[PDB]
Design a protein around this nucleic acid. Structure first.
Ligand code: MG
Ligand code: MG
Ligand code: MG
Ligand code: MG
Ligand code: MG
Ligand code: MG
Ligand code: MG
Ligand code: MG
Ligand code: MG
Ligand code: MG
Ligand code: MG
Ligand code: MG
Ligand code: MG
Ligand code: MG
Ligand code: MG
Ligand code: MG
Ligand code: MG
Ligand code: MG
Ligand code: MG
Ligand code: MG
Ligand code: MG
Ligand code: MG
Ligand code: MG
Ligand code: MG
Ligand code: MG
Ligand code: MG
Ligand code: MG
Ligand code: MG
Ligand code: MG
Ligand code: MG
Ligand code: MG
Ligand code: MG
Ligand code: MG
Ligand code: MG
Ligand code: MG
Ligand code: MG
Ligand code: MG
Ligand code: MG
Ligand code: MG
Ligand code: MG
Ligand code: MG
Ligand code: MG
Ligand code: MG
Ligand code: MG
Ligand code: MG
Ligand code: MG
Ligand code: MG
Ligand code: MG
Ligand code: MG
Ligand code: MG
Ligand code: MG
Ligand code: MG
Ligand code: MG
Ligand code: MG
Ligand code: MG
Ligand code: MG
Ligand code: MG
Ligand code: MG
Ligand code: MG
Ligand code: MG
Ligand code: MG
Ligand code: MG
Ligand code: MG
Ligand code: MG
Ligand code: MG
Ligand code: MG
Ligand code: MG
Ligand code: MG
Ligand code: MG
Ligand code: MG
Ligand code: MG
Ligand code: MG
Ligand code: MG
Ligand code: MG
Ligand code: MG
Ligand code: MG
Ligand code: MG
Ligand code: MG
Ligand code: MG
Ligand code: MG
Ligand code: MG
Ligand code: MG
Ligand code: MG
Ligand code: MG
Ligand code: MG
Ligand code: MG
Ligand code: MG
Ligand code: MG
Ligand code: MG
Ligand code: MG
Ligand code: MG
Ligand code: MG
Ligand code: MG
Ligand code: MG
Ligand code: MG
Ligand code: MG
Ligand code: MG
Ligand code: MG
Ligand code: MG
Ligand code: MG
Ligand code: MG
Ligand code: MG
Ligand code: MG
Ligand code: MG
Ligand code: MG
Ligand code: MG
Ligand code: MG
Ligand code: MG
Ligand code: MG
Ligand code: MG
Ligand code: MG
Ligand code: MG
Ligand code: MG
Ligand code: MG
Ligand code: MG
Ligand code: MG
Ligand code: MG
Ligand code: MG
Ligand code: MG
Ligand code: MG
Ligand code: MG
Ligand code: MG
Ligand code: MG
Ligand code: MG
Ligand code: MG
Ligand code: MG
Ligand code: MG
Ligand code: MG
Ligand code: MG
Ligand code: MG
Ligand code: MG
Ligand code: MG
Ligand code: MG
Ligand code: MG
Ligand code: MG
Ligand code: MG
Ligand code: MG
Ligand code: MG
Ligand code: MG
Ligand code: MG
Ligand code: MG
Ligand code: MG
Ligand code: MG
Ligand code: MG
Ligand code: MG
Ligand code: MG
Ligand code: MG
Ligand code: MG
Ligand code: MG
Ligand code: MG
Ligand code: MG
Ligand code: MG
Ligand code: MG
Ligand code: MG
Ligand code: MG
Ligand code: MG
Ligand code: MG
Ligand code: MG
Ligand code: MG
Ligand code: MG
Ligand code: MG
Ligand code: MG
Ligand code: MG
Ligand code: MG
Ligand code: MG
Ligand code: MG
Ligand code: MG
Ligand code: MG
Ligand code: MG
Ligand code: MG
Ligand code: MG
Ligand code: MG
Ligand code: MG
Ligand code: MG
Ligand code: MG
Ligand code: MG
Ligand code: MG
Ligand code: MG
Ligand code: MG
Lengths: 64, 149, 116, 202
RNA sequence: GGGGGGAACCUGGGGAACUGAAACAUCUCAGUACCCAGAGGAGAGGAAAGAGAAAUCGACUCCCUGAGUAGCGGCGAGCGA
RNA sequence: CUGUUGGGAAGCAGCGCCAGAGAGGGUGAAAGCCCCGUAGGCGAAAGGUGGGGGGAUAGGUGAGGGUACCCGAGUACCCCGUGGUUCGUGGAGCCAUGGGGGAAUCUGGGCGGACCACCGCCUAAGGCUAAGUACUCCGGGUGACCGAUAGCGCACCAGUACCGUGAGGGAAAGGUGAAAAGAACCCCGGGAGGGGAGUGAAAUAGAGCCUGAAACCGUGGGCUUACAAGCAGUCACGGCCCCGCAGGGGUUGUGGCGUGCCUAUUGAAGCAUGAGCCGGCGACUCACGGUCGUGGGCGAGCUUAAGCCGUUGAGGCGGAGGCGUAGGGAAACCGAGUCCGAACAGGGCGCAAGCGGCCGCAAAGUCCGCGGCCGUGGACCCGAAACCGGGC
RNA sequence: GUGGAGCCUGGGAGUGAGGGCGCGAGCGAUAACGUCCGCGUCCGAGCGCGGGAACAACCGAGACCGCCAGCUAAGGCCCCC
RNA sequence: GGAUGACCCCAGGCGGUAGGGGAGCGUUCCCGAUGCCGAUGAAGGCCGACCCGCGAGGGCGGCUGGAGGUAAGGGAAGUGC
RNA sequence: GGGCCUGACUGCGAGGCCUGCAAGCCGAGCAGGGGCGAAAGCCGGGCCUAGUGAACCGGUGGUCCCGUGUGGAAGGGCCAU
């Protein structure tokens, strides 16, 4: 049968133009009050995943 | 050029790897699975694309971004599509949506919008909208933009 | 379609067994006991060819020595005469000489006796 | 651009045709593979251990019998039981690209012409559906059947006398195919047959 | 007129567990296996109190596509128009 | 048709003919022309079918006004408990209904995802309806389907013998030859059996019957063996035996060397696993989907699915749809940029894309074939203890 | 320094029980064919071969095939040899 | 070297378990076949001290057997104990 | 120890340490609006290395991005906690 896309993956990750995988930096969902402004802000930026894990994630989104 | 001349090109039909067939062959006995463990067993190994030993999987430690939407459907609404200027060089005369579709340029059922990467050939073009800077290269290169509906 | 066994098996078995006539018990009669004996034979061969070189050497040298005794010197000097002089007759040959050419051998003893 | 020896009911001729300059044998092979593939039955079938007539029942207790552990006699390792990866009925047919099938038909004829063993004919003289007639027509035609003939025309009359002969493969013209061309030695087509074939490579 | 039978196939009334989730309880297996009723050469459905954004289509059934899309989901495993 | 070889022509030879029939199968072996057929045509008094054609009947068919009589009740609808849906209480509608409350009859009512307004779509609480769809007990057709440990459990008097109180389980077992010509009669024998004889092409085709392997048992022959220590072999030399005419083959006296196979393990000759021996079955696959590679086709394009037509081992059609040509952003939205931002800082994710004089050449991409892998299925094969269901 | 070196990108893996030895330490008892690290090596996979009586890892030495040729290594040169 | 793997000269590498890559042998079936071998003997079986191949093998000869077998080149797998 | 103050910032971030992943760590410089100082300048908490908890579900404050035919609204998103 058709493979199914991992919905959890499609909700967390993005495939870029050139193949990279992209996600949101972890560690500002809570416990924020004491975290530095430098910390709090750097956790905005999307980050690129390291290839072996990115590549694995990729196989989970067959249709994109 | 008869029947015993019909013959596939050099390796466009490889033979197949045949494990389980004696020593010399290279993969007999274990038949390439090495020795024991889950991954030997007739069955797997669980999904190598996400299972991480029982650990919290490297995917699911990552957060979730933005609207996932919810029941009942997706909102249906005006979908667009980008066709450039560098594309319309392959025409002369007027250019319309449905035309552009047939050209193998436009995905049908999306409202064409013209965006200008390139050079505007003296033309009349009919888009559902124009990227502000396609309007530019196009007008002043002697052409006529038709914002249609 | 069914590619059944049919004849292949009987033919390798008939093979290895014929490779093994002369053997004791089922080493000549059972396929797998023949097959097993033949693994043995194989390496006993490959070893024993490499062995038989050195084997003969030993034979000759023991004769050679026995000859140089008969003219009052040991093998191990006689082969330093022959050396430092210049004679390069190998010992298949020395052993041959010394058996069936006593005088012709005696010469060499002498030139070896000398070359010291 | 090729010269087809047209057989005129008044002597002879030569035709332009204009076929591929270039023979690709691998494409020929690909197009023939497809043909005999798609035309298989796929009717071999065996029963799997779970499709056999036997009882699902353990044949003696696991431990302590002294014999080896067994499930039920449905199992492949027992004489009787289902076979392992059996043939199961399937569909070898596939959808070879349309272009590739065209260039096949182009190349095939193109080769037969290039060898001289093609021949376009206008209509068949003394032959109204009666073997010995055709047989004798073919005689005046330049084929005594020491070489095989692929023969094309929509004309049940002609190809009817022309059936039954060893050296003749009959065809209608919409049914021109590349196995059949290569299959034979000598193509003797025909003019509307020729236009259906020409209506094709376009 | 009914009653009983009939390889599957169909509709209805009921309806599991192993298994999956590398444990497990919501979830999965699955409205599956199976019991029972009934109908037939098929069976069910069927002439809009429909659909759902086209100021549009126009009974039902079945096929391909839509689409593993929209979504559903201890937002897990998976499920899925 | 004739000749020839052969037990036997259908082989081989000479000379011919038919083909809308050179599919197939038989006949003492290999037959277009001997047999059964094949192509092509022909056929129903009776029974059944009869969706095509013919006929007949039930059946059907106007416009404006007025009135406000009718338009499916314990129903809508609202609330509580569930179910169905992709929808697991969710913003939770819709359709179905167990319990309570309970209408209206076109200025009626249900829906368009809480609800309200608007703007729409439809007429619920009565019933019937062909076709296109599913199946295969049966009958026909066809196999890059099996050939008696296979294929159905069953080629055979098999759901049998047998096993079980029962539900239930469930076998083995095909072949003489062309033709029974199935061995008269004779002799040893109580017979079984055999020896002559007789048939046959063949009788080590003799019914325990084609072929007739291997383990296993025997008779005969050559070498060898009773002071010898062994994973049974190997190397070397010699003897005797056979084939032959400086060469071989067989056997083994003496010497040298030498710790079975498999498996599992740090490590096994191992006193760790399995195997009495032979034979025959016995384990990495298939489909759909991914991702690479690969041989080809086409190239800013590539490609059809289901189906329609054609052929019955002929291919064609069909552009619905799919991937590709633009990205960035949760999104609106913008676009060679876009996002974050007050920034026209700076960053993140993007765009710059191959060689000559339009062509070529090569390809981005896509389609098919093949090969390696992955995901879904039992997914390399045998294996539980158990769980659940209906029955006995 | 041209090597079965290295770097870049992809395809397929197996492994994630190691053991002995030398040296440096912890643990143990200045015990263990003991345990745990570190640096090396060899066995694993070189139970192929010479030495060590025999004998995975100690010394010699990395076995493509053949030779009734030659030099050597460790270790040996009184007989077994 | 020469001229597009024709074959010669030279130098070098070639222990190997898990495992990766390569090149081949054979079995059943299909196109090749309306063909071709075959009772002057098919497949199968039993010998061989001969021939080719590194090898899996393939030839060739004798006995047995008594009606089948099937090439060059390709294809497909219920393919090797 | 004293005076003044709140940079215990907002928007970013070249280049690194570290590392299997995911995290952790350091940081000049530009812009906005500031603190202290006459000035050069220094301030994005604390002499430094511990005082911590990924996702998921939900709360609250803003933003006013989506809003299931339209206007809203229910509910979601982004930012902060
Ligand atoms: Mg994203
Ligand atoms: Mg959290
Ligand atoms: Mg938050
Ligand atoms: Mg898609
Ligand atoms: Mg894309
Ligand atoms: Mg293949
Ligand atoms: Mg291979
Ligand atoms: Mg091998
Ligand atoms: Mg390999
Ligand atoms: Mg190996
Ligand atoms: Mg084995
Ligand atoms: Mg492997
Ligand atoms: Mg594997
Ligand atoms: Mg094992
Ligand atoms: Mg292990
Ligand atoms: Mg493993
Ligand atoms: Mg498993
Ligand atoms: Mg979404
Ligand atoms: Mg067969
Ligand atoms: Mg087999
Ligand atoms: Mg024998
Ligand atoms: Mg012997
Ligand atoms: Mg040796
Ligand atoms: Mg030596
Ligand atoms: Mg010397
Ligand atoms: Mg059964
Ligand atoms: Mg049964
Ligand atoms: Mg069963
Ligand atoms: Mg049971
Ligand atoms: Mg037991
Ligand atoms: Mg036992
Ligand atoms: Mg089991
Ligand atoms: Mg059985
Ligand atoms: Mg069976
Ligand atoms: Mg395929
Ligand atoms: Mg014919
Ligand atoms: Mg025919
Ligand atoms: Mg022919
Ligand atoms: Mg039901
Ligand atoms: Mg129950
Ligand atoms: Mg479980
Ligand atoms: Mg448990
Ligand atoms: Mg438990
Ligand atoms: Mg479900
Ligand atoms: Mg009934
Ligand atoms: Mg029907
Ligand atoms: Mg019906
Ligand atoms: Mg109605
Ligand atoms: Mg949610
Ligand atoms: Mg005669
Ligand atoms: Mg005759
Ligand atoms: Mg003849
Ligand atoms: Mg015919
Ligand atoms: Mg013949
Ligand atoms: Mg015949
Ligand atoms: Mg007929
Ligand atoms: Mg009224
Ligand atoms: Mg309710
Ligand atoms: Mg529900
Ligand atoms: Mg619900
Ligand atoms: Mg829940
Ligand atoms: Mg709901
Ligand atoms: Mg409503
Ligand atoms: Mg109710
Ligand atoms: Mg109701
Ligand atoms: Mg009302
Ligand atoms: Mg309602
Ligand atoms: Mg309602
Ligand atoms: Mg509606
Ligand atoms: Mg609404
Ligand atoms: Mg409606
Ligand atoms: Mg009504
Ligand atoms: Mg009604
Ligand atoms: Mg009805
Ligand atoms: Mg009905
Ligand atoms: Mg119907
Ligand atoms: Mg079926
Ligand atoms: Mg057959
Ligand atoms: Mg049977
Ligand atoms: Mg048999
Ligand atoms: Mg049976
Ligand atoms: Mg039967
Ligand atoms: Mg009984
Ligand atoms: Mg009984
Ligand atoms: Mg009879
Ligand atoms: Mg008596
Ligand atoms: Mg008698
Ligand atoms: Mg007698
Ligand atoms: Mg008798
Ligand atoms: Mg015989
Ligand atoms: Mg016989
Ligand atoms: Mg018998
Ligand atoms: Mg017979
Ligand atoms: Mg017999
Ligand atoms: Mg017998
Ligand atoms: Mg004897
Ligand atoms: Mg004696
Ligand atoms: Mg004594
Ligand atoms: Mg004696
Ligand atoms: Mg001893
Ligand atoms: Mg001898
Ligand atoms: Mg000996
Ligand atoms: Mg020796
Ligand atoms: Mg020994
Ligand atoms: Mg072995
Ligand atoms: Mg073990
Ligand atoms: Mg152990
Ligand atoms: Mg152990
Ligand atoms: Mg190991
Ligand atoms: Mg023992
Ligand atoms: Mg054990
Ligand atoms: Mg043992
Ligand atoms: Mg074992
Ligand atoms: Mg026993
Ligand atoms: Mg066996
Ligand atoms: Mg595989
Ligand atoms: Mg299959
Ligand atoms: Mg693939
Ligand atoms: Mg071009
Ligand atoms: Mg096309
Ligand atoms: Mg997007
Ligand atoms: Mg903004
Ligand atoms: Mg930028
Ligand atoms: Mg090209
Ligand atoms: Mg390409
Ligand atoms: Mg993979
Ligand atoms: Mg299993
Ligand atoms: Mg229980
Ligand atoms: Mg019960
Ligand atoms: Mg290397
Ligand atoms: Mg290397
Ligand atoms: Mg490296
Ligand atoms: Mg592989
Ligand atoms: Mg470990
Ligand atoms: Mg350890
Ligand atoms: Mg260690
Ligand atoms: Mg180590
Ligand atoms: Mg070590
Ligand atoms: Mg230890
Ligand atoms: Mg120690
Ligand atoms: Mg120690
Ligand atoms: Mg070894
Ligand atoms: Mg090593
Ligand atoms: Mg060693
Ligand atoms: Mg040992
Ligand atoms: Mg040693
Ligand atoms: Mg030693
Ligand atoms: Mg020396
Ligand atoms: Mg020394
Ligand atoms: Mg060499
Ligand atoms: Mg070497
Ligand atoms: Mg090697
Ligand atoms: Mg055969
Ligand atoms: Mg044929
Ligand atoms: Mg034949
Ligand atoms: Mg002949
Ligand atoms: Mg005869
Ligand atoms: Mg004969
Ligand atoms: Mg024979
Ligand atoms: Mg026959
Ligand atoms: Mg053949
Ligand atoms: Mg072949
Ligand atoms: Mg098999
Ligand atoms: Mg202060
Ligand atoms: Mg501040
Ligand atoms: Mg940086
Ligand atoms: Mg990092
Ligand atoms: Mg500033
Ligand atoms: Mg300042
Ligand atoms: Mg100041
Ligand atoms: Mg200042
Ligand atoms: Mg600063
Ligand atoms: Mg969770
Ligand atoms: Mg949340
Ligand atoms: Mg809000
Ligand atoms: Mg709005
Ligand atoms: Mg709205
Ligand atoms: Mg709100
Ligand atoms: Mg912020």
């Amino acid at each position: 049968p058709k493979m199914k896309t991992h919905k959890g993956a499609k909700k967390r990750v993005k495939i870029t133009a050139s193949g990279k995988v992209v996600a949101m930096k972890t560690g500002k969902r809570h416990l924020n009050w004491q975290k530095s402004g430098k910390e709090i802000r750097q956790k905005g930026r999307k980050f690129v995943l390291a290839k072996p894990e990115a590549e694995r994630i990729k196989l989970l989104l067959p249709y994109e | 050029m008869k029947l015993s001349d019909l013959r596939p090109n050099p390796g466009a039909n490889k033979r197949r790897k045949r494990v389980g067939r004696g020593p010399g062959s290279g993969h007999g006995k274990t038949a390439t699975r090495g020795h024991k463990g889950q991954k030997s067993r007739s069955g797997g190994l669980k999904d190598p694309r996400r299972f991480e030993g029982g650990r919290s999987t490297t995917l699911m430690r990552l957060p979730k971004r933005g609207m996932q939407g919810q029941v009942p459907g997706e909102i249906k609404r005006p979908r667009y599509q980008g066709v450039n200027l560098k594309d319309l060089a392959r025409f002369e005369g007027e250019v319309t949506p449905e035309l552009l579709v047939r050209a193998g340029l436009l995905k049908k059922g999306y409202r064409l919008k013209i965006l200008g990467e390139g050079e505007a050939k003296p033309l009349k073009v009919v888009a559902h909208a124009f990227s502000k800077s396609a309007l530019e290269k196009l007008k002043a290169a002697g052409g006529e933009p038709v914002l249609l509906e | 379609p069914r590619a059944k066994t049919g004849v292949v098996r009987r033919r390798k078995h008939k093979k290895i067994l014929k490779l093994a006539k002369g053997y004791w018990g089922l080493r000549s009669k059972s396929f797998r006991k023949a097959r097993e004996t033949l693994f043995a034979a194989g390496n006993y061969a490959y070893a024993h060819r490499k062995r038989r070189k050195r084997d003969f050497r030993r034979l000759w040298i023991v004769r050679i020595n026995a000859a140089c005794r008969q003219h009052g010197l040991n093998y191990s000097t006689f082969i330093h005469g022959l050396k430092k002089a210049g004679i390069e007759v190998d010992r298949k040959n020395l052993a041959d000489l010394a058996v069936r050419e006593p005088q012709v051998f005696a010469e060499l003893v002498e030139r070896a006796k000398a070359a010291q | 651009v090729y010269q087809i020896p047209v057989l005129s009911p008044s002597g002879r001729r030569e035709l332009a045709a204009d076929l591929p300059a270039e023979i690709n044998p691998h494409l020929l092979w690909e197009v023939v593979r497809w043909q005999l593939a798609k035309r298989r039955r796929g009717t071999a079938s065996t029963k799997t251990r779970g499709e056999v007539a036997y009882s699902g029942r353990k044949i003696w207790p696991q431990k302590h019998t002294g014999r080896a552990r067994h499930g039920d006699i449905g199992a492949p390792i027992f004489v009787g039981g289902g076979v392992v990866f059996g043939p199961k009925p399937r569909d070898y047919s596939y959808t070879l690209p349309k272009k590739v099938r065209k260039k096949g038909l182009a190349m095939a004829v193109a080769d037969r012409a290039r060898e001289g063993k093609l021949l376009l004919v206008e209509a068949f003289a003394g032959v109204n559906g009666k073997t010995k007639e055709f047989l004798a027509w073919a005689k005046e035609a330049g084929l005594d059947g020491s070489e095989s003939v692929l023969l094309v025309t929509g004309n049940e009359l002609v190809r009817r006398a022309a059936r039954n002969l060893p050296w003749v493969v009959t065809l209608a013209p919409e049914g021109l195919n590349v196995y059949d061309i290569v299959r034979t030695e000598r193509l003797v087509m025909d003019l509307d047959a020729w236009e259906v074939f020409q209506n094709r490579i376009g």
